[PDB]
């Protein structure tokens, strides 16, 4: 109902068992939607989209990630 709580994947727009390349593969469609010059609006969410594709872009952050992530 106000599902705020939730993990990068379900932020980035890609099911919570995305591949890192369905990450990296929707995070370019996303810009492409989000980005300032072409969404005024939406400028500040640009901002999670990479806070989320940081840590499922290396694979010692991924590796902590998947099993504790406050890491």
Same mark, same amino acid.
């Given at each position: 109902?106000?599902?705020?709580?939730?993990?990068?994947?379900?932020?980035?727009?890609?099911?919570?068992?995305?591949?890192?390349?369905?990450?990296?593969?929707?995070?370019?469609?996303?810009?492409?939607?989000?980005?300032?010059?072409?969404?005024?609006?939406?400028?500040?969410?640009?901002?999670?989209?990479?806070?989320?594709?940081?840590?499922?872009?290396?694979?010692? +952050?991924?590796?902590?990630?998947? +099993?504790?992530?406050?890491?």
């Amino acid at each position: 109902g106000m599902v705020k709580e939730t993990t990068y994947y379900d932020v980035l727009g890609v099911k919570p068992n995305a591949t890192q390349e369905e990450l990296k593969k929707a995070y370019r469609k996303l810009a492409l939607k989000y980005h300032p010059d072409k969404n005024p609006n939406e400028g500040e969410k640009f901002k999670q989209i990479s806070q989320a594709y940081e840590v499922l872009s290396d694979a010692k +952050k991924r590796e902590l990630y998947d +099993k504790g992530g406050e890491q």
